[PDB]
Every structure is written in structure tokens, then in C-alpha cells.
Design a protein around this ligand. Structure first.
Ligand SMILES: Nc1ncnc2c1ncn2[C@@H]1O[C@H](COP(=O)(O)OP(=O)(O)OP(=O)(O)O)[C@@H](O)[C@H]1O
Ligand SMILES: Nc1ncnc2c1ncn2[C@@H]1O[C@H](COP(=O)(O)OP(=O)(O)OP(=O)(O)O)[C@@H](O)[C@H]1O
Ligand SMILES: [Mg+2]
Lengths: 239, 26, 211, 238, 48, 228, 48, 240
């Protein structure tokens, strides 16, 4: 082909600028994949962990970060950019709470991040910070909310989300799965998530290499599932 | 760099043929 | 049965091939690629086939092939010659007592003579001269000349970079002539440095805004 | 070659060509040497003439009662860094009523010259300093390079064709410790003749000496007190 | 090397056998070539 | 690839200052001599048209009552150097209530010079000769666009610099008198000129310790010329 | 077609310029005004 | 190729080239090894001599960042010195702000973020240093961390940086580090250093060791000369 805009952020003929696509496919060098689902009183995030050596510690690899007492986040793509992004998000939440007196909903926080990225790419001289965003949180009279932010300033919230390397297969599998019936029960969500990852990766999971995170109306506090309880969940779903 | 170029040519050497000798030696 | 090696043109691979030939008695047979293109009749096919037949004759035989690699990747002789090479390449006796050495400086194209599936086997890379390479090369080529004992070859290796063994030989040549200019009885480190400036045609003067 | 353009760009071999290109700026100027004793630090500079009727350019310049520098390379950056020297030493004397130790001054200079080799819009400082000083720990000899690397050395020499001075220093390294001034001076300046080509010899017109001691303030001699130092030396073995 | 072939073997060097000449047009090359063909005392061959 | 003042060379040679160095080559010659009795200075005028006003074009300007400057090279930049020299001299006098040595004046000027790219433009393209009488006696200094000091006993700048340098080297000696130096310099200037020397092509300047004023000669050059 | 012939010609020079059996007291001069359009194979140490 | 000049541009595949050029540039520095014992942390560095005119105290690669933190620079020296200055300033700022010693994890994150700040704009170039941080506290134990120029930071039990980055850790991992004190580590890491191509083709080098853990009451300092020389004897005869 040809590259009118291959070097910077200007419009090509046919009106398609080429740097943001490179940013989009720069998301796959992480070599991971994550899934997120929503049930009537629960929100679940599942992802896998790769530990290629034993000299590596185990508590300094998790990609699950706490945003605030009711809002949790998961990351993809490269690493450092994710840390900068979560630092910005924490700052935004604190400022909102100080200014307005009540709690930040997930919607406004997601919009703030999207606007940041958009202004960031409108001008030149700044590399558009290539990492994807997924957040979950519980609020009242809406229940569980799951949202995702895009390196081009797009954001949307939806029932079944997948990201990483195998999205084209995991999303299709979730489409086939969810059409029959809604995942009403709490444990069906974990069922569906584990089964989706197992089928898309064509392998079952040793418990020490999986990270999951759930939030429920019973306790909006963010919580990370420990090894024993994931053992119980896996052996229950895998009889 | 597109091409609209040209070139020269070498000749065709093969032209000779044998002929009947007409020596007169007694 | 055949081994390839590639690298920068300054590496002097011919040195290695020749030294290996001296270290054997396998009826040294030599060839050059461009010189094989002759008379627009794919004649190179006939010469290649002659060569291999002779190799089968003089069973302890090494094939030496160094240059030709372009086969028209952008000429009707060249495809035929590549055919001759490639077919006779895998027609060799499986017992394998003739050997083949191919030492080209390009890997610029890969269409000709695929390096996998048994058509070709071993590869060798050649680095550009390293730190020890330069000191060693100058130290060997100087061996005939009378040299002062205290030449710090390490500084010479330090100042040379992007600058290959053949040029180091040229420096070893030039220092002697320079010394002959002033009638010097033996070479000195400054003579070497001036040579190391001479071979790139630079000139030294007093610029008048330094120091 | 397109990587050989600016300071902010790397190379596929992981090198920056601009620092290396600024390195040879120190090979254009004259040669000078420096060394230290148990109680004194002495540096020697060769003054280069311009024409037959022009004054020779000066190399050794005064900085402060306990610190001096030589010079080798560009002229502009030389005066700029000298100005910085004076300013910093005077500030420390004003604030703490004590002289500034040499080591932290050198560290500050490294910090100062670091910035241009990473920002866009300025060239590095191509000057080969040699710092000689005396502090509570005794004498001190230091070197800096355009690459913002500073070294401690017991003896050093820089400039055009400076390796010969290095080799001579190596073959006579041992005995610099116990010798005093009036032989250490000629011991050090015996290293310049190797720099000189074999047709001319060192004279009384083109040499400068700087000495700093424990009780002797930093002092510069040239053209008048050089004669007591240049008398009685072994001529080159021609 | 064509008149005093002893310095090279005395010191231990070998005489070169090829020289290329280059410069801007008019600088003065072919004139030097013509000059050396006067005091050559040997066969000279002009080549078209 | 020397299209930048802020760039080095594969051998380490700045290729912008060199061009300004040679830009002086096509100015006009000027010769200066130092002597125990005082400092002498001569120039060529190189008049363009007979319809010019001769005094509008000058080469010697008196910075102070005891210092003088000769100029070669570009025209515009000379003004920017000269006014700074005058201002600095007056400021130093105001602060310290005395007159500085010529060496410090050269120092201030050069300190201005070396900021072509140092701050945060092209380098200046002129060459200057400073001559004066300080407490040490007569003094003469040479200043070039790189910002380098130098003291010279006798020096010629501009075009024909090397042409006159060799000739000047053979006749100078320290045991010299001002009267003889003026004549020698005029002889040199006659040889290097292409127009027949007269009184409308040169202009002199002399400064003496006890005669620090009168830095010109006007229309008695005719009798200075005729005795050649 | 026509061009390649000259190629052969230049090769016949090069391999005849060097090889084995030192040529001896036979010297060659090359002169040109346009050096940058020369085949690098000519600048081999031993030929020029 | 293109796309490899600026640090603010993506490749068609989607990776920035300047940072990885820095990655492959840092490889040529000499190897330094950080290891931890159940009650301390050990830093070991190899340092090549230059000429014979050096006092042996030049080019120190161990820096007193704070009262309890260790520094393990490896790469281009000037950039490392600048980073050390940044870390010192950050620690002093935190001390003034809240009046107690900075936790190791927090400081490591701050320095990593500041390092990451130089991989976005096109007017600057990425750093050329990867190093280590380590600290022992009576409340938190022994902590180690490693920083690379890309901007990635997390901990280890033991790691190495240099040419033989993996070769050293190959035989480091065969040590059951969980239960011996650092007094034995001091003598074994010298042999660890001497194992991998120290003077196969070089001229000479010299080794320096650091000390931080429970023994020093949370203090970080260079090892005493007697223990270091004893370790040298043990390692050199072990080499035999
Ligand atoms: N490692 C080396 N040691 C000594 N001499 C060397 C070395 N490498 C190259 N040379 C020099 O190179 C010359 C021979 O190499 P040659 O010119 O044949 O190069 P090559 O790279 O093999 O050629 P080609 O361009 O055909 O691939 C001799 O002058 C030899 O001294
Ligand atoms: N240094 C010189 N001394 C005397 N004459 C010179 C000099 N340089 C050039 N010339 C004159 O140049 C003229 C022709 O020079 P010449 O034929 O050598 O040029 P050339 O460089 O070979 O040119 P081209 O490459 O176009 O053939 C002669 O009239 C010769 O007198
Ligand atoms: Mg001609």
C-alpha cells in the first residue's frame, strides 16, 4: 500500500489516520487475555498469569489494581503505561470525592479517562499510551456495572467482555453461550468464565496461575479470591 | 524508478559459406 | 555435503578457504560466479556439469564457489545455470566423499538454492572485526618489517572502528613507505598513526580556534 | 548514516554517535600532563605559538587558592566552565566560611554537563579538563571528558599524541610518591619531549607549570622561573 | 623501483604497482602523465 | 551536511565557524604596528564612486580618548560590537572612577561574541584590531569571530593578509621608532595596492602616552607620501 | 543483447591484472575525472 | 526501515524501537548480581580496571541512596549518577513531608514512574541504565527490586545484569537461599563471580561487595575489608 500518515497523526485520503490502528494492535504484545461477566447481583473478572521463572515473586505480578473502595480495575497490554493510567484514575477519584461530597459513579470516571486520551491524541508530541481498561463496580438502582476504555477515547459498557489476543474467539463463544439464558446465579458466572478461558486456550487451569475478582451486593468492597476458595470453585465446576 | 529506456545491438556474425576450390596443379 | 558462509566484504573469507585447502589434499578445484556467465548459451550449465564430473573423477575433491547469487530476482543464462547447480546439488553420491564450499557475501535473496530440506546444510556467519581482530591483524601483517618494540597496538585497535582487516593491511603497508620518506630505520607509533590518517585521505593542519 | 545526526537518537548497535564525535575535539589541541606527589600536585602545559610575532596562547589559568585547571580543546566552552568554577567556589566560601573540597565540585560539574547530552537544542561541551587541587585529604588529580565521565588518576596526559606520555608514566610510575618538587618538576616535564618531534626541543618560551601544595598556594610559573627548572636535564638519545 | 631497487629490500617493503589519479577537470593530471613519459628510459604505451 | 551550527563532524570540526572565519577574506586590508613610543595603524579605503562622500565610509573609530579600533569584514556587525565596547568602558569608569586596560575591553567584547548558539543565530563575521595606551604602555590586540584573544606586535588583516604578512615579517624589529614604522607600513601598503597610491585612499592613526589625543592625520599625508 | 559484451572485456582485464606469477617491472597508470562511478572491485589492495 | 528514529512513533507491528535499542545497548556493561538471604541482602559488582594509572576507587557503582537502600547501577555511568541524585531528592522530600523513612515499594514506584516519563516526548531520549534497589527493615524484612529502562518494576529473590545475565542466574538458582544467613552468601557469591568468564580474555578486574540486613540494624554499607579479603581467598582457591 502507501503510508501518507504512517509517521504522524494527520488525515490520509479516504479519511483514515494510521497511528491509532498501530496503537490498537500494539495491545497484543502483552500476550495475555482477560474476560469479564455480569450477573444480577455479581460482577466477575477472570484472567491468567504467566510466571516464567521461580526466582520471580508471586505477590508482585498481579494485574488487579484497586481503584477505590467500590471500584476495581483490570489491565491489558504493556505494563508501565497501565501503572501511569491507574495513578491518574486514583487521582481523579480522590479529587471528585473532595470536590463534590458524595461518591464517584463508574460512568463519570470512565468518561474522564476517555476525555484524557482524546485530548492526548488531538495534539502531537505525545504517544497515545497503548493500554486497554476494564472496570467493575456496584452502585444502587443500577446494580453491577462493567465498562471498558479504548486507547482512542472510546468507551462502552456491556454484558460480556473479552480482551487480549483471542477476543475474536472468546467473544463469539460468549455470544453462543449467553443467547439461551441469562447467567442468573452467582456461581454460573464463574462457571462461564472458567469454561470460556479453558475452551479458548484448550487447556484446564492449575489454580496457582489464575486470578479472579468479584463484587456482590452483599459486600460492595473489592475482594481478591484466595487459593483455597478458587480450588473449591474449580472442583465444584469440574466434578 | 520507472523505465522507458532503450538499447543498442550487436551484429549477426554467421555469414560465411564454403566454395568450390579451383586450384590448377599438375 | 555443502557449507555456506556469509558476511561483510571486508572479512577476507578467501583467506579461510585457501588455508583449509592447504590443510587438505583434496585436489583443489576453484570457481568464480560472474565469470561463469558466457556467450548467452547457459554455458554455465555445461561448465558446472564439467566441474562436478571432474570432482567425481578426482574423488577427493573440494568445490570452491564464492560469488554468483543473483538469478533474476528483479538473463536467460542465469536460470539455466541455477538449475544446473541445484539439480547437481542433490544428485551427489550419498556416500559423499566430494565436498562443496560456498562462501558468498550476500544473503540478499533466498529464491536460489533453498537452505532447507537437504538442498543445503550448514551455515556460517562472519562478524565484522572485533577488538582483538584488529590488533591481531596488524600484528601479523607487520611481521616482515622492522618495528619498534613499544607500539601500543591497543590504541590502534581503539581508534579503528568500522574499518576492516584489509585496511589494517594497508596501514601496515603505508607505515613503511612513510618511514622511507624520512629514511627512518624502523617504524614508530607516530608513523602508524599518520598512516591511520593517510588511508582515508584526510589532512592535518592547525585549525586556529582550538586550545 | 542517517542515525549519525543528533544527540537524541540511538543506533542499532546501541551507541550515540554525537558523543563519540565530540570526543575527538580533545585531540585537536596541544598536549599536557599532570601528576601528584605525597605532598604536592604538579601539572605541566605546552603553549602553542600562532605565528612568528604573536603571543602564545595560554593554557593554565587560575581558579582559586587551592584549585587550578589546565585546558585542552575548544576555547568557548573552556571560558564558560571556568566562569562556573569561580562562581561555585566563591559561593561556598561565602556561605560556610570554608573552602570547597574538590570531589563534590567535580560531581557538580558532571551534573552540570549531563543535561545537554539528553535535551534537544544544545551541543555538548567539548573540553578536556584536568583539575589539580589540595584539600584536607591531601593532593588530588582529576579528569573529565565530554561524555560526562570523571576519573581519578595518579598521573595522566591528554592532547595530540599523548600516548607516549602515558607509556613513560607507566614505566616510571613507582617513584613519584617519595620525590620532592625540584626533581618532580623535571621528572614530569620529561614526558613532553616524547610529544615533540625529534627535530625541535623544549625551550624557555613555550611551557607553563602549575603547582599546588599543602602550605603553598596554587602558583603558576612561566617564562621567568622556568629557567631554574629547565637546567640540568638529560638530552634525548639521538 | 626502476632505478634504485635496493632500499625496499634493504628495509623490507615491497613496491606498489598501481596508481590512480583524481581531481577536478583541468587540475593538471594528463600533463604529469606526459611529463613522466619524457624521462622514462623505458617502454611507454598510450592506450585509447 | 554542515547546514547546522549545532552539529559536529566525523573528525570533530565545527563547520559553521570556519565559514565565518573565511568570510573576512573579501574585506579590505588593514595594518597595525606596536612601538615603544606608541601605536600606529593604517588602512586602505577602497573608494567605490567619485560621487561618494569620503567621510561617510570609515575604518577607524575612537572608542575612548585612549583607545582605537580598526575593522574588517561585514559592515553591519561592526556597529553592534563598537557600541557595546563604548558602553562597557563608560560603565566601568562610572563604577570604579578610572580607565580600564585594553585587555579587559577585549575580554568584554569577546564575552559578547561567543553567544551565537550558547544562549537558550549566526556568529558575527568581522575581525577587529584594538590599539591603545594603558598603564603598561602601548598595547595592541587582535580579535577574530571565534572569540579568541591574542596580542600581536604587528599584524595585517583582511584580504592580502598573507601577502603582506611575509613582507612585514622581514623588516620588523623591537628597537624601532614610530617615525620609521609609519613609513614602512606605507611602503607595504603601496606594494599591495592595485591603484596608484595617493592621499585619498588611506587614513592613519597614531596614539602616544603623553599625546593620547589626536588619533588622526588630516591633509598632511601629502608630505608624508611625497618623500617616499 | 549488446551491452553485456563490455562487461566481459573489463573482467578480462581484472583477472589478468593479478593472480599468480608476479608481473614484475610492469607498471600501470589509471587516470579519471569522475572517480565516484568506478567499480569498487578495482580498489582491491593488490590491483590499485 | 523507518519508524525507528523518534521515540513517539509506532511500527506497523506496533512496538517502539528506541527503548529496545536502549535494551540492547545496556548489555555490554559488566555484570552485577543482587541476592537475598533470609536476614539480609547482598550486592556484588565486577569492575574492570583501565590502564594501570587508576587509584582503584574511581567509578564506584555502589551508592548511598538513603540510610537503608542499596544502589546497583549498570549501564552508562552518567545517567546512573543522575538517577541516584533523583532518588536522593525524592527520599528527602518524603522525609520532610511525613517524618519517617520511605517504604521501599513506594520509592521504587516513584523512581520507576519518573523513568517512564522519558519514553513519550520526541525531544528527549530514553535512559540507558537498569539497576537494583534493596532494603531491610525490622518490620518488613528484606526487600529487593529491579528497574529496567522500559519502566517495569517488581521484585525478586536474586538477579543479575550484564553480559552473562542468564549464565550467572543459572547457578545462582541452585542455592537454597531461603534459610542461610548472608555470612555464607558473602563467601559464595565471590566464587559465583569468578565462575563466569572473569579473566578468560580480559586484563584485570576487581570486585566490590555491599551489606544490608538484620546484622547491621537496618543499616546499608560496604563490607569490612577483612571479611571481603577472606571471601577472596576462599573463592580463588575454590576456583582451582
Ligand atoms: N582475519 C584476517 N586476517 C588477516 N588478513 C585478513 C583477514 N581478513 C581479511 N584479510 C586480508 O584480506 C585480504 C584477502 O581477503 P579478500 O580480499 O579475498 O576478501 P574476501 O572478503 O574473502 O573477498 P570477497 O569480496 O570476494 O568476499 C588479504 O589482504 C588479507 O590480509
Ligand atoms: N600546475 C600546472 N602547471 C602548469 N600548467 C598547468 C598546471 N595545471 C594545469 N595546467 C595547464 O592545464 C592545461 C591542460 O591540463 P591537463 O591536460 O593536465 O588537464 P586534465 O586535468 O588532464 O584534464 P581532463 O581531465 O579534462 O583531461 C595545460 O595547458 C597545462 O599547462
Ligand atoms: Mg587529461
Amino acid at each position: 500500500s502507501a503510508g501518507f500518515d504512517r509517521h504522524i497523526t494527520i488525515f490520509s485520503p479516504e479519511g483514515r489516520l494510521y497511528q491509532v490502528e498501530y496503537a490498537f494492535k500494539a495491545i497484543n504484545q502483552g500476550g495475555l487475555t482477560s474476560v469479564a461477566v455480569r450477573g444480577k447481583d455479581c460482577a466477575v473478572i477472570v484472567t491468567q498469569k504467566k510466571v516464567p521463572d521461580k526466582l520471580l515473586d508471586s505477590s508482585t505480578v498481579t494485574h488487579l489494581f484497586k481503584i477505590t473502595e467500590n471500584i476495581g480495575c483490570v489491565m491489558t497490554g504493556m505494563t508501565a503505561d497501565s501503572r501511569s493510567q491507574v495513578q491518574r484514575a486514583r487521582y481523579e477519584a480522590a479529587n471528585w470525592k473532595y470536590k463534590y461530597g458524595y461518591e464517584i459513579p463508574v460512568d463519570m470516571l470512565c468518561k474522564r479517562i476517555a476525555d484524557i486520551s482524546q485530548v492526548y491524541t488531538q495534539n502531537a508530541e505525545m504517544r497515545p499510551l497503548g493500554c486497554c481498561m476494564i472496570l467493575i463496580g456496584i452502585d444502587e438502582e443500577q446494580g453491577p456495572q462493567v465498562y471498558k476504555c479504548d486507547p482512542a477515547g472510546y468507551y462502552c459498557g456491556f454484558k460480556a467482555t473479552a480482551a487480549g489476543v483471542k477476543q475474536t474467539e472468546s467473544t463469539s463463544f460468549l455470544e453462543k453461550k449467553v443467547k439461551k439464558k441469562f447467567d442468573w446465579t452467582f456461581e454460573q458466572t464463574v462457571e462461564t468464565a472458567i469454561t470460556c478461558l479453558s475452551t479458548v486456550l484448550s487447556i484446564d487451569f492449575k489454580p496457582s496461575e489464575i486470578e479472579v475478582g468479584v463484587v456482590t451486593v452483599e459486600n460492595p468492597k473489592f475482594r481478591i479470591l484466595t487459593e483455597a476458595e478458587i480450588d473449591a470453585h474449580l472442583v465444584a465446576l469440574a466434578e | 524508478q520507472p523505465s522507458g529506456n532503450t538499447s543498442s545491438s550487436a551484429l549477426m556474425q554467421g555469414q560465411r559459406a564454403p566454395q568450390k576450390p579451383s586450384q590448377n596443379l599438375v | 555435503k555443502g557449507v555456506l558462509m556469509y558476511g561483510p566484504p571486508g572479512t577476507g573469507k578467501t583467506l579461510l578457504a585457501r588455508a583449509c585447502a592447504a590443510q587438505t589434499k583434496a585436489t583443489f578445484l576453484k570457481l568464480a560466479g560472474p565469470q561463469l556467465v558466457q556467450m548467452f548459451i547457459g554455458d554455465g550449465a555445461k561448465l558446472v556439469r564439467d566441474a562436478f564430473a571432474l570432482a567425481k573423477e578426482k574423488a577427493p575433491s573440494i568445490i570452491f564457489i564464492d560469488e554468483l547469487d543473483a538469478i533474476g530476482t528483479k538473463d536467460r543464462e542465469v536460470q539455466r545455470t541455477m538449475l544446473e547447480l541445484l539439480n547437481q546439488l542433490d544428485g551427489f553420491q550419498p556416500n559423499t566423499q566430494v565436498k562443496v564450499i560456498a562462501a558468498t557475501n550476500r544473503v540478499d535473496i533466498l529464491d536460489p538454492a533453498l537452505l532447507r530440506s537437504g538442498r543445503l546444510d550448514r551455515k556460517i556467519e562472519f562478524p565484522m572485526p572485533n577488538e582483538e581482530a584488529r590488533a591481531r591483524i596488524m600484528q601479523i601483517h607487520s611481521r616482515k618489517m622492522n618495528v619498534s618494540p613499544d607500539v601500543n597496538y591497543e590504541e590502534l585497535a581503539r581508534c579503528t572502528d568500522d574499518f576492516n582487516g584489509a585496511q589494517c593491511k594497508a596501514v601496515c603497508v603505508e607505515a613503511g613507505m612513510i618511514a622511507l620518506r624520512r629514511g627512518a630505520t624502523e617504524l614508530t607509533h607516530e608513523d602508524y598513526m599518520e598512516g591511520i590518517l593517510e588511508v582515508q585521505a584526510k589532512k592535518k593542519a592547525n585549525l586556529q580556534y582550538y586550545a | 548514516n542517517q542515525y549519525d545526526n543528533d544527540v537524541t537518537v540511538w543506533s542499532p548497535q546501541g551507541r550515540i554517535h554525537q558523543i563519540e564525535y565530540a570526543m575527538e575535539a580533545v585531540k585537536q589541541g596541544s598536549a599536557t600532563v599532570g601528576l601528584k606527589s605525597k605532598t604536592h600536585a604538579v601539572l605541566v602545559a605546552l603553549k602553542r605559538a600562532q605565528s612568528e610575532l604573536a603571543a602564545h596562547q595560554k593554557k593554565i589559568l587560575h581558579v582559586d587558592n587551592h584549585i587550578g585547571i589546565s585546558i585542552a580543546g575548544l576555547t568557548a566552552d573552556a571560558r564558560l566552565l571556568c566562569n562556573f568554577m569561580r562562581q561555585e567556589c566563591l559561593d561556598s566560601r561565602f556561605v560556610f566560611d570554608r573552602p570547597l573540597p574538590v570531589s563534590r565540585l567535580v560531581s557538580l560539574i558532571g551534573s552540570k554537563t549531563q543535561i545537554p547530552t539528553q535535551r534537544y537544542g544544545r551541543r555538548p561541551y567539548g573540553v578536556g579538563l584536568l583539575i589539580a587541587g589540595y584539600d584536607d585529604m591531601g593532593p588530588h588529580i582529576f579528569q573529565t571528558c565530554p561524555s560526562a565521565n570523571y576519573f581519578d588518576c595518579r598521573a595522566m596526559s591528554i592532547g595530540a599524541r599523548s600516548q607516549s606520555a602515558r607509556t613513560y608514566l607507566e614505566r616510571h610510575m613507582s617513584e613519584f610518591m617519595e620525590c620532592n618538587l625540584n626533581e618532580l618538576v623535571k621528572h614530569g616535564l620529561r614526558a613532553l619531549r616524547e610529544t615533540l618531534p625529534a627535530e625541535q626541543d623544549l625551550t624557555t618560551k613555550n611551557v607553563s607549570i602549575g603547582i599546588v601544595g599543602k602550605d603553598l598556594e596554587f602558583t603558576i610559573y612561566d617564562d621567568d622561573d622556568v629557567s631554574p627548572f629547565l637546567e640540568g636535564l638529560e638530552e634525548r638519545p639521538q | 623501483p626502476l632505478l634504485h631497487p635496493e632500499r625496499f629490500v634493504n628495509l623490507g617493503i615491497e613496491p606498489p604497482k598501481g596508481v590512480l589519479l583524481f581531481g577536478p577537470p583541468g587540475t593538471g593530471k594528463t600533463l604529469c602523465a606526459r611529463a613522466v613519459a619524457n624521462r622514462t628510459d623505458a617502454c611507454f604505451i598510450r592506450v585509447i | 551536511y554542515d547546514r547546522g551550527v549545532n552539529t559536529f563532524s566525523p573528525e570533530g570540526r565545527l563547520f559553521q565557524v570556519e565559514y565565518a572565519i573565511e568570510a573576512i577574506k573579501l574585506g579590505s586590508t588593514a595594518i597595525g604596528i606596536q612601538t615603544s613610543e606608541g601605536v600606529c595603524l593604517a588602512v586602505e579605503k577602497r573608494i567605490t564612486s567619485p560621487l561618494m562622500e569620503p567621510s561617510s565610509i570609515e575604518k577607524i573609530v575612537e572608542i575612548d580618548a585612549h583607545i582605537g579600533c580598526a575593522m574588517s569584514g561585514l559592515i553591519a556587525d561592526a556597529k553592534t560590537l563598537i557600541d557595546k565596547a563604548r558602553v562597557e568602558t563608560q560603565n566601568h569608569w562610572f563604577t570604579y572612577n578610572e580607565t580600564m586596560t585594553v585587555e579587559s575591553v577585549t575580554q568584554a567584547v569577546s564575552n559578547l561574541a561567543l553567544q551565537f548558539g550558547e544562549e537558550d543565530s549566526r556568529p558575527f563575521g568581522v575581525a577587529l584590531l584594538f590599539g591603545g595606551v594603558d598603564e603598561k604602555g602601548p598595547q595592541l590586540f587582535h580579535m577574530d569571530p571565534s572569540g579568541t584573544f591574542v596580542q600581536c606586535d604587528a599584524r595585517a588583516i583582511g584580504s592580502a593578509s598573507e601577502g603582506a604578512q611575509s613582507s612585514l615579517q622581514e623588516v620588523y624589529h623591537k628597537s624601532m621608532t614610530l617615525k620609521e614604522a609609519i613609513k614602512s607600513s606605507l611602503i607595504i601598503l603601496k606594494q599591495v595596492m592595485e591603484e596608484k597610491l595617493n592621499a585619498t585612499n588611506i587614513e592613519l592613526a597614531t596614539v602616544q602616552p603623553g599625546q593620547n589625543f589626536h588619533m588622526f592625520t588630516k591633509e598632511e599625508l601629502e608630505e608624508v607620501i611625497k618623500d617616499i | 543483447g549488446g551491452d553485456n559484451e563490455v562487461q566481459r572485456t573489463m573482467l578480462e582485464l581484472i583477472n589478468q591484472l593479478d593472480g599468480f606469477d608476479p608481473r614484475g617491472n610492469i607498471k600501470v597508470l589509471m587516470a579519471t575525472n569522475r572517480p565516484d562511478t568506478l567499480d569498487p572491485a578495482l580498489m582491491r589492495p593488490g590491483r590499485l | 526501515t523507518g519508524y525507528d528514529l523518534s521515540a513517539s512513533t509506532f511500527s506497523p507491528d506496533g512496538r517502539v524501537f528506541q527503548v529496545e535499542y536502549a535494551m540492547k545497548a545496556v548489555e555490554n556493561s559488566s555484570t552485577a548480581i543482587g541476592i537475598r538471604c533470609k536476614d539480609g541482602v547482598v550486592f556484588g559488582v565486577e569492575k574492570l580496571v583501565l590502564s594501570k594509572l587508576y587509584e582503584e576507587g574511581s567509578n564506584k557503582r555502589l551508592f548511598n541512596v538513603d540510610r537503608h537502600v542499596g544502589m546497583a547501577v549498570a549501564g552508562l555511568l552518567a545517567d546512573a549518577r543522575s538517577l541516584a541524585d533523583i532518588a536522593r531528592e525524592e527520599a528527602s522530600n518524603f522525609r520532610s513531608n511525613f517524618g519517617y523513612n520511605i517504604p521501599l515499594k513506594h520509592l521504587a514506584d516513584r523512581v520507576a514512574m519518573y523513568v517512564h516519563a522519558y519514553t513519550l516526548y520526541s525531544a528527549v531520549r530514553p535512559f540507558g541504565c537498569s539497576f537494583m534497589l534493596g532494603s531491610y527493615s525490622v518490620n518488613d524484612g528484606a526487600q529487593l527490586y529491579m528497574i529496567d529502562p522500559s519502566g517495569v518494576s517488581y521484585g525478586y529473590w536474586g538477579c543479575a545484569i550484564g553480559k552473562a545475565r542468564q549464565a550467572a542466574k543459572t547457578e545462582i538458582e541452585k542455592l537454597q537461599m531461603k534459610e542461610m544467613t548472608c555470612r555464607d552468601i558473602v563467601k559464595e557469591v565471590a566464587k559465583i563471580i569468578y565462575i563466569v568468564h572473569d579473566e578468560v580474555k580480559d586484563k584485570a578486574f576487581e570486585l566490590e561487595l555491599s551489606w544490608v540486613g538484620e546484622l547491621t540494624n537496618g543499616r546499608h554499607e560496604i563490607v569490612p575489608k577483612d571479611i571481603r579479603e577472606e571471601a577472596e581467598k576462599y573463592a580463588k582457591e575454590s576456583l582451582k
